[PDB]
């Protein structure tokens, strides 16, 4: 909508006071004008119809249960944003500042989040499984990688073009929760998943087994639920990614880590540079190489543990 920019305040799902940026014209507007082309967030008052409509508020304070969801994804949209075009000098996902566009409150009893190929979308969850989905950075950020998946690579959702592109959005998720550096770590989920149960979360990256997920090529998922697995397959990638950060010893293939910033680094340029639709794990492997011998050097350390770490999940 056209209107001036406002700031308005409220609080997220996990109960946090935050400033967001707002529109106004005769209402305040989940708007925010201040990144790109504009972010919006839309309520779908429990249907399926989207986007539904653009968020409306009287008083630019969203302080109301019913508000919480649509303030948390508005503001980790914005920090998203941030870090791709501060952190990868990408301006939103398709790199020319295309609007980014969100609903809450999808369905009724939603236990998911999903970029629709337009869009986020997130539930409520049923308060057993998830609480409203939004409220975890990570979250968000996975949701909008998916785009930028979607604009770059364009990794098939299927086998194991998909695993990769669950884990680009894992991995990014990650990235942005560290960047952002509110309770860190390599759990996918936390912050919304089971609120009954203390320390879990939905994947792990750095012990995907924790969840049942396979850490070896050798244990992955060769059937047809999940599109071939690609929420399980992802756990190899994830952990390849957790082991160029980190370090550590894996099946006795030991990885001197060398920090989140150039595994970051890394695999945005394999993404927007050397990966296509149908991508394999071995082809994954050559660009993560490909880009760190691009970014660090043929005889680098860079280098040589991004080949430790895809040798310790068994892609060769
Ligand atoms: C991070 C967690 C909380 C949510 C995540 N959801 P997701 O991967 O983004 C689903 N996207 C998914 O299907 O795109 C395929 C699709 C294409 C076009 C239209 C609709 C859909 C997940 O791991 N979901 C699995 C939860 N068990
Ligand atoms: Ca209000
Ligand atoms: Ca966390
Ligand atoms: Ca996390
Ligand atoms: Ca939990
Ligand atoms: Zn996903």
């Given at each position: ?7 308005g305040?409220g609080?997220?799902?996990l109960?946090?006071?935050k400033n ?55 503001y ?24 980014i ?23 409520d969850?049923?308060?057993?499984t ?65 609120p009954?149960?203390?320390g ?11 969840y049942?997920?396979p ?27 957790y ?10 293939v ?15 340029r ?12 071995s ?34």
């Amino acid at each position: 909508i056209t209107g001036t920019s406002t700031v308005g305040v409220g609080r997220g799902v996990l109960g946090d006071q935050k400033n967001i940026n707002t529109t106004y014209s005769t209402y305040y507007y989940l708007q925010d004008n201040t990144r790109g082309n504009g972010i919006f967030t839309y309520d779908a008052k429990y249907r399926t119809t989207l986007p539904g409509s653009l968020w409306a508020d009287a008083d630019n304070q969203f302080f109301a249960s019913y508000d919480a969801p649509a303030v948390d994804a508005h503001y980790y949209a914005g920090v998203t944003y941030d870090y791709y075009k501060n952190v990868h000098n990408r301006l939103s996902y398709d790199g020319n500042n295309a609007a980014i566009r969100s609903s809450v409150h999808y369905s009724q009893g939603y236990n998911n989040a999903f970029w629709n190929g337009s869009q986020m979308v997130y539930g409520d969850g049923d308060g057993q499984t998830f609480i409203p989905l939004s409220g975890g950075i990570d979250v968000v950020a996975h949701e909008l990688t998916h785009a930028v998946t979607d604009y770059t690579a364009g990794l098939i959702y299927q086998n194991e073009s998909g695993a990769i592109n669950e884990a680009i959005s894992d991995i990014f998720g990650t990235l942005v929760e560290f960047y952002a550096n509110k309770n860190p770590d390599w759990e996918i989920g936390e912050d919304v998943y089971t609120p009954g149960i203390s320390g879990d979360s939905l994947r792990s990256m750095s012990d995907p087994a924790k969840y049942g997920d396979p850490d070896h090529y050798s244990k992955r998922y060769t059937g047809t639920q999940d599109n071939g697995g690609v929420h399980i397959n992802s756990g190899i990638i994830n952990k390849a990614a957790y082991l160029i950060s980190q370090g550590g010893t894996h099946y006795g293939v030991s990885v001197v880590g060398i920090g989140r910033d150039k595994l970051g680094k890394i695999f945005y340029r394999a993404l927007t540079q050397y990966l296509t639709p149908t991508s394999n794990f071995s082809q994954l492997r050559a660009a993560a190489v490909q880009s760190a011998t691009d970014l660090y050097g043929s005889t680098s350390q860079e280098v040589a543990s991004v080949k430790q770490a895809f040798d310790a999940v068994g892609v060769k």
